[PDB]
Design a binder for this molecule. Sequence first.
Ligand code: JF8
Ligand code: JF8
Lengths: 204, 216
Amino acid sequence: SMKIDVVTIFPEYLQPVLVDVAVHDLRRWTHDVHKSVDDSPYGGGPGMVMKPTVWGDALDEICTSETLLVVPTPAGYPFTQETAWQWSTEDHLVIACGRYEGIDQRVADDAATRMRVREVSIGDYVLNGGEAAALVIIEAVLRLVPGVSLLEGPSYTRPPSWRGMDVPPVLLSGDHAKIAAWRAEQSRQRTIERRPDLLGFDSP
Amino acid sequence: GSMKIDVVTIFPEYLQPVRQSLPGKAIDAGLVDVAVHDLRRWTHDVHKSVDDSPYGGGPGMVMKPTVWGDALDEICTSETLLVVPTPAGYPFTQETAWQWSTEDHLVIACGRYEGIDQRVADDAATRMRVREVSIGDYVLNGGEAAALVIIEAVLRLVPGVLGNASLLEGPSYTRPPSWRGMDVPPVLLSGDHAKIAAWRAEQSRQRTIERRPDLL
Ligand SMILES: N#Cc1c(-c2ccc3cc[nH]c3c2)n[nH]c1N
Ligand SMILES: N#Cc1c(-c2ccc3cc[nH]c3c2)n[nH]c1N
């Protein structure tokens, strides 16, 4: 049993999403006519920063002391399969999706005084906001919820010959030991080629 | 400055946010076109089968090479960069995103189940460029969420497409100067712009040590 609340200024983007997922429009917690959620940065720089006031009101309504507050950010701790396993047994995730140049840092800092907060990144690339990260996190976590290292080698299915390209003969041989051995080898070879860091080697 | 992206998936509805993400100005200008295709269009049988049991045994199913082969034959050309999300891929990084942002045609092949018969990529690679990539060290149900991430990271680097314009980035602040007992760091209001730059550099250094020491 898990509840996920997602807060965003683009609730439309969350449509592709024992478990309930609710999406909230951040602008619901504004009071001005223009529904402003952003302001220019202190200290200079391009772009806009999301106001802490509006976020504070939203999270006040949605969160409890037992909530795990998830804040996607390119400067976050890495979100990995380990993280997904850890969050898979949580009762309540709230995912705060930023836009513009992100959310005023005091939102997470203040939240951390009364709940657990996790600033995380889903990978070493830049997005325009937290919504795609939210989709990734939700997918990776929900598939691990009860009741729902190395790289994987290549997989094959019928026909055994296609366009003059054959399924590796060992996979047709019914020899479980030889097949397991071949698959372990294919895995380790793919890992050293594509992800040498996983085996403790320098990256290209 | 212009790019066509074709996405092939058994869940075309999943790619709805991307079409929503696209400003009319870039489309009208012919700067960008994202098309999504139902893989089942290329199935051969009345049951519209896209998957079959894996050779050598094991759990799950593998996507059929015959179906994918027909789809890619129709959609791809010699200029195509074929992108195949997979947890076993090379890492997709910002460097990758910058490279791909200058391409004219991306085709993203979204798998499901235990992925796509390897001969599809191997065959495709004999007449176009193929890139098997992973967006991170976690496991998804299929390639669609990865496609969303890749499309966003690439298209935001193409001038005027999405509307937007080393160490980790540091914290950002805006009004009010004091909020729930927390003050914006006074240096940011000091008007000492060299000092502010140095402060930001130190925040970035500390954050990187704490969160991503691998980058150091
Ligand atoms: N997680 C993650 C992210 C993001 C991201 C997250 C939130 C915001 C808010 C404004 N821009 C954002 C980018 N970019 N790249 C990642 N791996
Ligand atoms: N990229 C990427 C992926 C995936 C992914 C991609 C395609 C398929 C097809 C079946 N299962 C998949 C998982 N999982 N985790 C990642 N970083």
